[PDB]
Amino acid sequence: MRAVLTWRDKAEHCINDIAFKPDGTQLILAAGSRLLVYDTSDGTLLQPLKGHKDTVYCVAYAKDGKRFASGSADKSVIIWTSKLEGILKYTHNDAIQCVSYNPITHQLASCSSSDFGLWSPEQKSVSKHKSSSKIICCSWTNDGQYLALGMFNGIISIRNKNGEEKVKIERPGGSLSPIWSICWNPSSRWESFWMNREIQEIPSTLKNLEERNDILAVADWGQKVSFYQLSGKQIGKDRALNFDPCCISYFTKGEYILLGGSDKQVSLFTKDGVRLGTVGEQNSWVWTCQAKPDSNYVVVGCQDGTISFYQLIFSTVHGLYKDRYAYRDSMTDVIVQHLITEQKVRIKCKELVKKIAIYRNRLAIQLPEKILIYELYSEDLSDMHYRVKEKIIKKFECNLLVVCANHIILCQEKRLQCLSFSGVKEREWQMESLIRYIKVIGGPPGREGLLVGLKNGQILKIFVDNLFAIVLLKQATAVRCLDMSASRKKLAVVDENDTCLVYDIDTKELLFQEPNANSVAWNTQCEDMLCFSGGGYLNIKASTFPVHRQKLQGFVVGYNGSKIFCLHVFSISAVEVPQSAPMYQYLDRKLFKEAYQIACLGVTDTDWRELAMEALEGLDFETAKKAFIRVQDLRYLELISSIEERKKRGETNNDLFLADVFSYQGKFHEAAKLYKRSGHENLALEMYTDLCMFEYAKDFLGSGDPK
Amino acid sequence: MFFYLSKKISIPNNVKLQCVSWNKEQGFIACGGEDGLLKVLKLESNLSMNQTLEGHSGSVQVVTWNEQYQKLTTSDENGLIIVWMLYKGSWIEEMINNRNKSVVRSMSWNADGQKICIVYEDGAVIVGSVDGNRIWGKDLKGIQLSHVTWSADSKVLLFGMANGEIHIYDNQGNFMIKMKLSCLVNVTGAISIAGIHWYHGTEGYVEPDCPCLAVCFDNGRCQIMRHENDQNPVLIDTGMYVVGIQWNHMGSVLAVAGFQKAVNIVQFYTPFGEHLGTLKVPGKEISALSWEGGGLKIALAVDSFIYFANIRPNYKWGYCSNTVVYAYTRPDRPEYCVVFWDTKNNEKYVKYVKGLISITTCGDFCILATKADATFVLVLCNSIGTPLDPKYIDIVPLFVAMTKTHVIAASKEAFYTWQYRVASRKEGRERIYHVDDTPSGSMGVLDYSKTIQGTRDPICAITASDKILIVGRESGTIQRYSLPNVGLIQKYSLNCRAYQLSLNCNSSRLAIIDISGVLTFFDLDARVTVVGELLKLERRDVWDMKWAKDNPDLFAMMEKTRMYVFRNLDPEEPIQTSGYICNFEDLEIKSVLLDEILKDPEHPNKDYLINFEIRSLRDSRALIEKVGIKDASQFIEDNPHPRLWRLLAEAALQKLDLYTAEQAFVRCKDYQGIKFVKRLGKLLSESMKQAEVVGYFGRFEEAERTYLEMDRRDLAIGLRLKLGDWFRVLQLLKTGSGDADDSLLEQANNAIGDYFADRQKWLNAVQYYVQGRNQERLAECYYMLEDYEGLENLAISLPENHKLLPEIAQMFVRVGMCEQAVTAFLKCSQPKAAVDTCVHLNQWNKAVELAKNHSMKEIGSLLARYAS
């Protein structure tokens, strides 16, 4: 999790309650006796709305886009509209603390110290209902049927649209713990109800639920947050806290929580309440925190007048071995995905998952406080039962995590440390410069390889067993991505100029360059198949040929068989390589054995037949045999067997065989000249007489007239 | 999307039907009467013509099948609800309930059949489970209900009032917001709903977030919204008292039944509001609709009848190479599933595609034109599904016409030309033209400033043959260009709007199937004093056509439920069939039954591929059957064509004439056939020539059995060896005995090892290569498997020297094992490459030991160099 600070405009007074236009374009703050209509885009402002006399304690929008209220201390709730005007100004007896609309019916509900009013838009008066203590938070249920009132008393009233008290929630600690913020979990079917939108005159005043799945998240001022269902039953157990809560909210789809509060910082908990980092450390207390709708953008208001508009960026955490792709989901779960059977498995970790490192029959997950090492135990190729093997418990600081059978490798600045599953620091290599990339390249079970790339430019292969780096190359610029050929003979290096370099690892020699690359993955199955992905374009070379570039969003993560595994916003995707194009590339250069090697990866039957013909004419009969076997033509196979049984006996001439092949396809004229050139026109004469094309056989009577 | 009436079942004693509900799971048609008549009908002509008069006094008004649980339901005007269950092939009368206040206006089962909502005219609402009627009974207000409908998740429950207000409810009686009605803006008089149908996503959605709900009012205006919209495809229809609404089973065509003033009509719309036709049902007044389960038939009530209307939907299918491509949607995934069913090997290759506007095939290629997240894509595909080249284009690819050399995907006002092959790979020269651009012979590149001018005469269809391009406009003014280098040649100004256009091989004649069913032939290159003319032919209900790829005159069309083959405008006895012409070539027509395939998209049977033969080939075959080859040869001589001649030759070879057959094989330049006939002539044995010829047609199993029966294991082994059936060779070598049996055995094992090794299936190639004696491939198979103990055994098994020991040693060096690498090198010749590794792998002490062993200790410094 990482948060960037888009703007930090600061107002003159202390922030009270912030509200977003549901479009997500203007955020009408609270600041003194005025309301500020900012622009989320830049940070600019429009005007401090002036209708109010006194300090504002709350604001809301309509989940529609037009009406938006603003409670205040002048004991009045002006219902401002879009285009920045104000329309009703119904009043109370007291300061209105929080005013929130209904998410379905737009029935505004504005509470104060003694009584909360309701006002449906069609209603000609405001219905006032008495309350026990000072009401401090309102939160309508997603379906708009219940409005729950936390209070300084420390008791959560829950009431219906009429106002009858259905049920009341008790927070232990009593008045010493005044609920100061609540929020109903906004993930429901109604969440998209409003995704398809398109003279201030007063108002007169007037004076089952067990099957329902909702959760009211309550942040006390007794240093706790809990999660209560609608029926009053608690879920889990109170979550202790060091800061005194002052804000609790949710993201767009209700998959996180913001909290924050007394201490000058806004956290980000999961729905379950586990900490997951920090948006930022503020300058004064945070009174409000609301994520932008349908966005990653959150906004923090404080007791300085400072308004910050952050963007959370969630860093992708993943690992891959061959066909297994374990990645982090919801920031506390790890999904291990088979790339062939596509049989996903989830592993729950309950804390932030920082790094995910995988290897054959190993799965390491770095939690903030410990490292879990998981093992596949059954000997099945598709086995997906990860069982817990070890728990190396220690606060680790490490840039890169790589797991090997019977070891773990932590890259931390220039030190490469090798720890065993038990924990002991078996070995450490003091690499001479910044380690940028590190990658396991197989080997024996315990004594394995590591391919370590430095910013120095060096490239090192390190064996886990022997404490001596084995250098490979010394190309210039830093090595942002590495990879090694299927046979561990050719290396592919991408160096902070998007320039895929491919090296022959045993002769320290270049082979070719490509000018756009962020990620390189050699084929696991066929040696001569590269695949980079630079600048939005996939590119698939084959040896030293031109590339075949498509378009693509993402970057390459693996390359198995015929499948480019591309990653784009947590979504793995398999791009099917066209093998026919490299096959034809190989055929034009008269490389038949390679052409077949590529064709085996899966091509059509017409391509198979084309390769078979071109093998025949090129006189590579073994490739022709395998091709025609894979098309199953008994005619051509029996021809090739006849030619082979001829060559087994004394038969060497290459123009007779090519003439036979041309004749047997049906040229009938190039075959003629080929027969002529060899010392057999008699064969041409037999051909033309068999086709009874006697006009032509007139001028293939080279022998004469010896009967 | 063509459609016509089929049949008219009738109901005795001229009662007036008021409600029809076609059950989707079981093809039961339950029709309400006007005097207590409640009948259940079924087809295949009726099978279960039934009379469930059990109960139901008075009239009968509403009827709903329960798709799950197959429980019928019915209501009288006497408030008498009934449920019917199928016991021993008949319908009986149970769960009788009666509330004695008012009349059941409407009923609805849940999306999952577990709950039923009934609304009464006086406003009272009762919702019951399958068993106990009274889950939640509410009496609402001074209102009069008329409809009720559940959402996809059975959560909202949107009533429909008498005055024309829809009220959204909660799955209880929690009145939420009234729906915002957008379809009516200028209306003034009283409005009743008369039709609501929420399409629960049960075969998936035509578009990932397409409209589902459908509200029409009886004045004639409809709105197809998703959930509760505020903008939504607004429709105007002229139907005086639009009386019905019915989604398709795929939620893809909306059938709207009413009647204009003018008389009965059933208009159609796609979910986005595009019109598709008009049915003109006879009779007095329609009263209700009902689609079949398979979406092919729509059954609609008129007076005392049930008129049935057939529908040909717009399947997205194709035929490229030997592959039937056909795309369908499925509830679990949100993207179209496209199946490249390779018929020849009976293999399936399922892909998933997002947009999928259309599929076009020509030759061995297939453009799946889609919508992307460069906004639209044309996925040019193999016959096995692998996308060769996604080309991003800007214009909306509504109409795609594929020639071998070029593709053309054209929107309503422009068309885009891209050359995807050379008569042989990509040589792309993309261009864009407006329709009214009048380009000259040749020229700009990729100018996308022409797709935005907008016109009054949209493109309705396009086609292109190998030479010319014909763009049809909705005013019939087809425009003809020279394809390789686009240039406007001629305009023709036909009569009617074109729906499908095709050209014969010579590209002189053009067939138009208009938006209705009408088919004509047009002649492009024939000068009347004008330039083109109609050609004095016209059929009625055409819904597919396909010219021959070889003969200009031959033509094929599917009219109604029959196929006609035309040879220059002279039809032939109509074959009876309901399939789509895949191919027309060599006097033979290959067609497929899409309707049966798409009822079971997962498992397409080969029984659904049908081959027909046009008259001439049928006469040749039948005459060869009846009279002997000697006479039929003269007959086929009368009228030459290579297909016929090859038929004659194969008939003779079957009879083993070997004299007629050779003459045929010369009449089709076929040197292969002549050479096979000669070889057959060498054989001096019958039952040997018979084996050769049953091998000629590819019946390899029959040939092998014949070879075994005549006690020739040798030739069966040989035949299975010529092909690749190495498993068969192993099985045959399991029994009997031959001249060189180990040789074949070992060869077969090695060959199976190669068979697996090319597919990257080691641990299977390794099982072989060992029963066989292979060394070169075996080490590679071990290496790619990371079975280094196995490499070590192999390296300690090979003889003292070998060609493979240095290779194994190289492998050990790369993987990093030093001991084993040294012992390998020592086993082979070089010790200097046994010490260069030890220094390279840093076990310096052992390097010193070796150097001392073989006396070339020139490595003095190096250790001190590494002492560092």
Side-chain angles (χ1 to χ4, degrees), chain A residues 145 189 193 196 360 468 576 596 630 664, chain B residues 153 174 227-229 351 672 759 786 866:
Chain A
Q145 298 191 161
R189 80 159 304 274
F193 209 95
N196 299 61
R360 43 188 302 162
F468 299 109
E576 314 169 34
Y596 178 79
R630 275 163 142 285
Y664 186 77
Chain B
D153 43 0
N174 308 324
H227 62 97
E228 171 259 339
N229 267 356
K351 309 304 168 171
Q672 296 189 3
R759 279 77 161 292
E786 298 182 2
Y866 208 64

PDB file of all heavy atoms in Angstrom, chain A residues 145 189 193 196 360 468 576 596 630 664, chain B residues 153 174 227-229 351 672 759 786 866:
ATOM      1  N   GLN A 145     -33.802   1.545   4.979  1.00  0.00           N
ATOM      2  CA  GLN A 145     -34.886   1.216   5.885  1.00  0.00           C
ATOM      3  C   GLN A 145     -34.599   1.509   7.342  1.00  0.00           C
ATOM      4  O   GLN A 145     -35.542   1.575   8.132  1.00  0.00           O
ATOM      5  CB  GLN A 145     -35.248  -0.260   5.777  1.00  0.00           C
ATOM      6  CG  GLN A 145     -35.734  -0.674   4.440  1.00  0.00           C
ATOM      7  CD  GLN A 145     -36.315  -2.046   4.485  1.00  0.00           C
ATOM      8  OE1 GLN A 145     -37.062  -2.448   3.601  1.00  0.00           O
ATOM      9  NE2 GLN A 145     -35.967  -2.792   5.524  1.00  0.00           N
ATOM     10  N   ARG A 189     -26.690  -5.238  -2.820  1.00  0.00           N
ATOM     11  CA  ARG A 189     -27.235  -5.165  -4.165  1.00  0.00           C
ATOM     12  C   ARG A 189     -27.715  -3.767  -4.517  1.00  0.00           C
ATOM     13  O   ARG A 189     -27.821  -3.444  -5.701  1.00  0.00           O
ATOM     14  CB  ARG A 189     -28.390  -6.133  -4.343  1.00  0.00           C
ATOM     15  CG  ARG A 189     -29.671  -5.594  -3.781  1.00  0.00           C
ATOM     16  CD  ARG A 189     -30.865  -6.286  -4.378  1.00  0.00           C
ATOM     17  NE  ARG A 189     -30.866  -6.206  -5.829  1.00  0.00           N
ATOM     18  CZ  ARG A 189     -31.371  -5.194  -6.515  1.00  0.00           C
ATOM     19  NH1 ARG A 189     -31.918  -4.157  -5.909  1.00  0.00           N
ATOM     20  NH2 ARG A 189     -31.309  -5.215  -7.842  1.00  0.00           N
ATOM     21  N   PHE A 193     -27.955   1.288  -7.204  1.00  0.00           N
ATOM     22  CA  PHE A 193     -29.272   1.871  -7.446  1.00  0.00           C
ATOM     23  C   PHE A 193     -29.168   3.169  -8.222  1.00  0.00           C
ATOM     24  O   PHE A 193     -30.020   3.468  -9.063  1.00  0.00           O
ATOM     25  CB  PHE A 193     -29.988   2.135  -6.128  1.00  0.00           C
ATOM     26  CG  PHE A 193     -31.473   2.073  -6.221  1.00  0.00           C
ATOM     27  CD1 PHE A 193     -32.156   0.925  -5.919  1.00  0.00           C
ATOM     28  CD2 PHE A 193     -32.189   3.189  -6.563  1.00  0.00           C
ATOM     29  CE1 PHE A 193     -33.525   0.886  -5.992  1.00  0.00           C
ATOM     30  CE2 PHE A 193     -33.549   3.151  -6.632  1.00  0.00           C
ATOM     31  CZ  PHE A 193     -34.219   2.000  -6.346  1.00  0.00           C
ATOM     32  N   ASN A 196     -27.118   4.893 -12.631  1.00  0.00           N
ATOM     33  CA  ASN A 196     -27.677   5.222 -13.931  1.00  0.00           C
ATOM     34  C   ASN A 196     -28.502   6.493 -13.862  1.00  0.00           C
ATOM     35  O   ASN A 196     -29.632   6.553 -14.343  1.00  0.00           O
ATOM     36  CB  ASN A 196     -28.504   4.065 -14.469  1.00  0.00           C
ATOM     37  CG  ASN A 196     -27.686   2.818 -14.654  1.00  0.00           C
ATOM     38  OD1 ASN A 196     -27.123   2.287 -13.702  1.00  0.00           O
ATOM     39  ND2 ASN A 196     -27.589   2.357 -15.888  1.00  0.00           N
ATOM     40  N   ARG A 360       8.797 -24.780  -6.856  1.00  0.00           N
ATOM     41  CA  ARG A 360       8.166 -26.085  -6.980  1.00  0.00           C
ATOM     42  C   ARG A 360       7.990 -26.711  -5.608  1.00  0.00           C
ATOM     43  O   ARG A 360       8.972 -27.008  -4.927  1.00  0.00           O
ATOM     44  CB  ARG A 360       8.987 -27.007  -7.875  1.00  0.00           C
ATOM     45  CG  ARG A 360      10.468 -26.944  -7.617  1.00  0.00           C
ATOM     46  CD  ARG A 360      11.221 -27.718  -8.649  1.00  0.00           C
ATOM     47  NE  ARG A 360      10.801 -29.107  -8.672  1.00  0.00           N
ATOM     48  CZ  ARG A 360      11.037 -29.928  -9.682  1.00  0.00           C
ATOM     49  NH1 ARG A 360      11.691 -29.526 -10.757  1.00  0.00           N
ATOM     50  NH2 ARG A 360      10.609 -31.185  -9.609  1.00  0.00           N
ATOM     51  N   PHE A 468      30.643 -18.379  -3.389  1.00  0.00           N
ATOM     52  CA  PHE A 468      31.406 -17.624  -4.377  1.00  0.00           C
ATOM     53  C   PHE A 468      30.527 -17.289  -5.566  1.00  0.00           C
ATOM     54  O   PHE A 468      30.100 -18.187  -6.290  1.00  0.00           O
ATOM     55  CB  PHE A 468      32.632 -18.398  -4.847  1.00  0.00           C
ATOM     56  CG  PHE A 468      33.605 -18.715  -3.761  1.00  0.00           C
ATOM     57  CD1 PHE A 468      33.761 -20.012  -3.317  1.00  0.00           C
ATOM     58  CD2 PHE A 468      34.395 -17.722  -3.210  1.00  0.00           C
ATOM     59  CE1 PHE A 468      34.676 -20.307  -2.328  1.00  0.00           C
ATOM     60  CE2 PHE A 468      35.308 -18.013  -2.227  1.00  0.00           C
ATOM     61  CZ  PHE A 468      35.450 -19.306  -1.784  1.00  0.00           C
ATOM     62  N   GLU A 576      -2.558 -16.509 -26.749  1.00  0.00           N
ATOM     63  CA  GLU A 576      -2.143 -17.697 -27.479  1.00  0.00           C
ATOM     64  C   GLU A 576      -1.199 -17.263 -28.584  1.00  0.00           C
ATOM     65  O   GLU A 576      -1.575 -16.488 -29.465  1.00  0.00           O
ATOM     66  CB  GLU A 576      -3.345 -18.451 -28.030  1.00  0.00           C
ATOM     67  CG  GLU A 576      -4.445 -18.627 -27.017  1.00  0.00           C
ATOM     68  CD  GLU A 576      -5.729 -19.137 -27.623  1.00  0.00           C
ATOM     69  OE1 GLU A 576      -5.670 -19.933 -28.584  1.00  0.00           O
ATOM     70  OE2 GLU A 576      -6.807 -18.743 -27.135  1.00  0.00           O
ATOM     71  N   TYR A 596       9.667 -27.866 -37.935  1.00  0.00           N
ATOM     72  CA  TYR A 596       8.882 -28.904 -37.287  1.00  0.00           C
ATOM     73  C   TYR A 596       8.870 -28.742 -35.778  1.00  0.00           C
ATOM     74  O   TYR A 596       7.840 -28.960 -35.129  1.00  0.00           O
ATOM     75  CB  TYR A 596       9.405 -30.274 -37.684  1.00  0.00           C
ATOM     76  CG  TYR A 596       8.658 -31.362 -37.001  1.00  0.00           C
ATOM     77  CD1 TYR A 596       7.432 -31.767 -37.450  1.00  0.00           C
ATOM     78  CD2 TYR A 596       9.206 -32.013 -35.928  1.00  0.00           C
ATOM     79  CE1 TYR A 596       6.752 -32.755 -36.820  1.00  0.00           C
ATOM     80  CE2 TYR A 596       8.541 -33.016 -35.303  1.00  0.00           C
ATOM     81  CZ  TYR A 596       7.310 -33.377 -35.748  1.00  0.00           C
ATOM     82  OH  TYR A 596       6.633 -34.384 -35.119  1.00  0.00           O
ATOM     83  N   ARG A 630       1.614 -36.725 -39.200  1.00  0.00           N
ATOM     84  CA  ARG A 630       0.667 -35.903 -38.459  1.00  0.00           C
ATOM     85  C   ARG A 630      -0.483 -35.379 -39.299  1.00  0.00           C
ATOM     86  O   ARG A 630      -1.433 -34.834 -38.736  1.00  0.00           O
ATOM     87  CB  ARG A 630       1.368 -34.751 -37.771  1.00  0.00           C
ATOM     88  CG  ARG A 630       1.928 -35.170 -36.443  1.00  0.00           C
ATOM     89  CD  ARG A 630       2.953 -34.209 -35.913  1.00  0.00           C
ATOM     90  NE  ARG A 630       2.797 -34.084 -34.470  1.00  0.00           N
ATOM     91  CZ  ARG A 630       1.824 -33.394 -33.889  1.00  0.00           C
ATOM     92  NH1 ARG A 630       0.885 -32.789 -34.598  1.00  0.00           N
ATOM     93  NH2 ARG A 630       1.785 -33.314 -32.566  1.00  0.00           N
ATOM     94  N   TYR A 664       4.591 -35.923 -58.755  1.00  0.00           N
ATOM     95  CA  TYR A 664       3.610 -36.640 -57.976  1.00  0.00           C
ATOM     96  C   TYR A 664       2.683 -35.660 -57.297  1.00  0.00           C
ATOM     97  O   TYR A 664       1.622 -36.054 -56.807  1.00  0.00           O
ATOM     98  CB  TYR A 664       4.314 -37.516 -56.946  1.00  0.00           C
ATOM     99  CG  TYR A 664       3.413 -38.417 -56.169  1.00  0.00           C
ATOM    100  CD1 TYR A 664       2.937 -39.565 -56.757  1.00  0.00           C
ATOM    101  CD2 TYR A 664       3.020 -38.136 -54.886  1.00  0.00           C
ATOM    102  CE1 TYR A 664       2.130 -40.422 -56.092  1.00  0.00           C
ATOM    103  CE2 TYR A 664       2.191 -38.995 -54.206  1.00  0.00           C
ATOM    104  CZ  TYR A 664       1.750 -40.139 -54.824  1.00  0.00           C
ATOM    105  OH  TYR A 664       0.921 -41.008 -54.167  1.00  0.00           O
TER     106      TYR A 664
ATOM    107  N   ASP B 153     -32.297 -11.371  -8.545  1.00  0.00           N
ATOM    108  CA  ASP B 153     -31.974 -11.971  -7.266  1.00  0.00           C
ATOM    109  C   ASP B 153     -33.189 -12.164  -6.378  1.00  0.00           C
ATOM    110  O   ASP B 153     -33.022 -12.444  -5.190  1.00  0.00           O
ATOM    111  CB  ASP B 153     -30.936 -11.120  -6.549  1.00  0.00           C
ATOM    112  CG  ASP B 153     -31.227  -9.650  -6.657  1.00  0.00           C
ATOM    113  OD1 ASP B 153     -32.241  -9.289  -7.282  1.00  0.00           O
ATOM    114  OD2 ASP B 153     -30.438  -8.848  -6.126  1.00  0.00           O
ATOM    115  N   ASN B 174     -42.132  -3.022   1.592  1.00  0.00           N
ATOM    116  CA  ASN B 174     -41.465  -1.758   1.852  1.00  0.00           C
ATOM    117  C   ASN B 174     -41.468  -0.943   0.570  1.00  0.00           C
ATOM    118  O   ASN B 174     -40.575  -1.074  -0.263  1.00  0.00           O
ATOM    119  CB  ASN B 174     -40.057  -2.019   2.358  1.00  0.00           C
ATOM    120  CG  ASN B 174     -40.039  -2.975   3.518  1.00  0.00           C
ATOM    121  OD1 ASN B 174     -40.935  -2.963   4.355  1.00  0.00           O
ATOM    122  ND2 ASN B 174     -39.037  -3.828   3.561  1.00  0.00           N
ATOM    123  N   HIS B 227     -32.213  -2.583 -14.606  1.00  0.00           N
ATOM    124  CA  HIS B 227     -32.735  -2.309 -13.264  1.00  0.00           C
ATOM    125  C   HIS B 227     -33.697  -1.120 -13.214  1.00  0.00           C
ATOM    126  O   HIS B 227     -34.773  -1.173 -13.805  1.00  0.00           O
ATOM    127  CB  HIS B 227     -31.585  -2.170 -12.257  1.00  0.00           C
ATOM    128  CG  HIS B 227     -30.629  -1.048 -12.516  1.00  0.00           C
ATOM    129  ND1 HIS B 227     -30.731   0.176 -11.895  1.00  0.00           N
ATOM    130  CD2 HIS B 227     -29.526  -0.982 -13.295  1.00  0.00           C
ATOM    131  CE1 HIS B 227     -29.747   0.957 -12.298  1.00  0.00           C
ATOM    132  NE2 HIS B 227     -29.000   0.278 -13.146  1.00  0.00           N
ATOM    133  N   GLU B 228     -33.364  -0.087 -12.464  1.00  0.00           N
ATOM    134  CA  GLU B 228     -34.052   1.202 -12.478  1.00  0.00           C
ATOM    135  C   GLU B 228     -33.117   2.238 -13.096  1.00  0.00           C
ATOM    136  O   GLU B 228     -32.267   2.814 -12.419  1.00  0.00           O
ATOM    137  CB  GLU B 228     -34.454   1.593 -11.090  1.00  0.00           C
ATOM    138  CG  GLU B 228     -34.972   2.981 -10.951  1.00  0.00           C
ATOM    139  CD  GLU B 228     -33.908   3.881 -10.385  1.00  0.00           C
ATOM    140  OE1 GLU B 228     -32.972   3.342  -9.769  1.00  0.00           O
ATOM    141  OE2 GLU B 228     -33.993   5.110 -10.549  1.00  0.00           O
ATOM    142  N   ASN B 229     -33.268   2.460 -14.392  1.00  0.00           N
ATOM    143  CA  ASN B 229     -32.484   3.450 -15.102  1.00  0.00           C
ATOM    144  C   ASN B 229     -33.095   4.824 -14.948  1.00  0.00           C
ATOM    145  O   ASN B 229     -34.137   5.009 -14.325  1.00  0.00           O
ATOM    146  CB  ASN B 229     -32.392   3.112 -16.579  1.00  0.00           C
ATOM    147  CG  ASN B 229     -31.174   2.319 -16.901  1.00  0.00           C
ATOM    148  OD1 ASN B 229     -30.352   2.067 -16.030  1.00  0.00           O
ATOM    149  ND2 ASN B 229     -31.030   1.927 -18.158  1.00  0.00           N
ATOM    150  N   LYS B 351     -12.800 -20.807 -27.322  1.00  0.00           N
ATOM    151  CA  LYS B 351     -12.235 -19.521 -26.957  1.00  0.00           C
ATOM    152  C   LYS B 351     -13.287 -18.685 -26.254  1.00  0.00           C
ATOM    153  O   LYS B 351     -14.457 -19.055 -26.183  1.00  0.00           O
ATOM    154  CB  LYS B 351     -11.697 -18.759 -28.165  1.00  0.00           C
ATOM    155  CG  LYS B 351     -10.769 -19.578 -29.013  1.00  0.00           C
ATOM    156  CD  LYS B 351      -9.628 -20.111 -28.165  1.00  0.00           C
ATOM    157  CE  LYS B 351      -8.829 -21.179 -28.889  1.00  0.00           C
ATOM    158  NZ  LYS B 351      -7.606 -21.521 -28.133  1.00  0.00           N
ATOM    159  N   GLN B 672      -1.307 -39.184 -59.579  1.00  0.00           N
ATOM    160  CA  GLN B 672      -1.319 -40.076 -58.427  1.00  0.00           C
ATOM    161  C   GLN B 672      -2.203 -41.281 -58.685  1.00  0.00           C
ATOM    162  O   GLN B 672      -1.831 -42.417 -58.372  1.00  0.00           O
ATOM    163  CB  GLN B 672      -1.817 -39.338 -57.195  1.00  0.00           C
ATOM    164  CG  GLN B 672      -0.949 -38.212 -56.744  1.00  0.00           C
ATOM    165  CD  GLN B 672      -1.392 -37.672 -55.418  1.00  0.00           C
ATOM    166  OE1 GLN B 672      -2.324 -38.194 -54.807  1.00  0.00           O
ATOM    167  NE2 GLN B 672      -0.739 -36.613 -54.963  1.00  0.00           N
ATOM    168  N   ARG B 759       6.241 -33.232 -27.997  1.00  0.00           N
ATOM    169  CA  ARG B 759       5.119 -32.561 -27.371  1.00  0.00           C
ATOM    170  C   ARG B 759       5.457 -32.092 -25.972  1.00  0.00           C
ATOM    171  O   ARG B 759       4.565 -31.651 -25.243  1.00  0.00           O
ATOM    172  CB  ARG B 759       3.906 -33.480 -27.331  1.00  0.00           C
ATOM    173  CG  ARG B 759       3.141 -33.525 -28.617  1.00  0.00           C
ATOM    174  CD  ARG B 759       3.883 -34.399 -29.603  1.00  0.00           C
ATOM    175  NE  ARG B 759       3.050 -34.868 -30.699  1.00  0.00           N
ATOM    176  CZ  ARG B 759       2.058 -35.734 -30.566  1.00  0.00           C
ATOM    177  NH1 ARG B 759       1.748 -36.256 -29.393  1.00  0.00           N
ATOM    178  NH2 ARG B 759       1.355 -36.084 -31.639  1.00  0.00           N
ATOM    179  N   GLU B 786      14.932 -32.311 -14.765  1.00  0.00           N
ATOM    180  CA  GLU B 786      15.663 -32.066 -13.525  1.00  0.00           C
ATOM    181  C   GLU B 786      15.790 -33.341 -12.694  1.00  0.00           C
ATOM    182  O   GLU B 786      15.596 -33.332 -11.479  1.00  0.00           O
ATOM    183  CB  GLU B 786      15.010 -30.952 -12.706  1.00  0.00           C
ATOM    184  CG  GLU B 786      14.977 -29.597 -13.378  1.00  0.00           C
ATOM    185  CD  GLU B 786      14.357 -28.535 -12.489  1.00  0.00           C
ATOM    186  OE1 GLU B 786      13.997 -28.867 -11.344  1.00  0.00           O
ATOM    187  OE2 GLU B 786      14.229 -27.373 -12.922  1.00  0.00           O
ATOM    188  N   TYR B 866      43.274 -16.487  -6.688  1.00  0.00           N
ATOM    189  CA  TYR B 866      42.039 -16.552  -5.922  1.00  0.00           C
ATOM    190  C   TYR B 866      42.286 -16.444  -4.430  1.00  0.00           C
ATOM    191  O   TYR B 866      41.359 -16.117  -3.685  1.00  0.00           O
ATOM    192  CB  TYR B 866      41.296 -17.850  -6.211  1.00  0.00           C
ATOM    193  CG  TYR B 866      39.810 -17.704  -6.027  1.00  0.00           C
ATOM    194  CD1 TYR B 866      39.099 -16.839  -6.844  1.00  0.00           C
ATOM    195  CD2 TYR B 866      39.114 -18.427  -5.071  1.00  0.00           C
ATOM    196  CE1 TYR B 866      37.742 -16.682  -6.714  1.00  0.00           C
ATOM    197  CE2 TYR B 866      37.740 -18.277  -4.933  1.00  0.00           C
ATOM    198  CZ  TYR B 866      37.062 -17.400  -5.762  1.00  0.00           C
ATOM    199  OH  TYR B 866      35.704 -17.233  -5.660  1.00  0.00           O
TER     200      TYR B 866
END
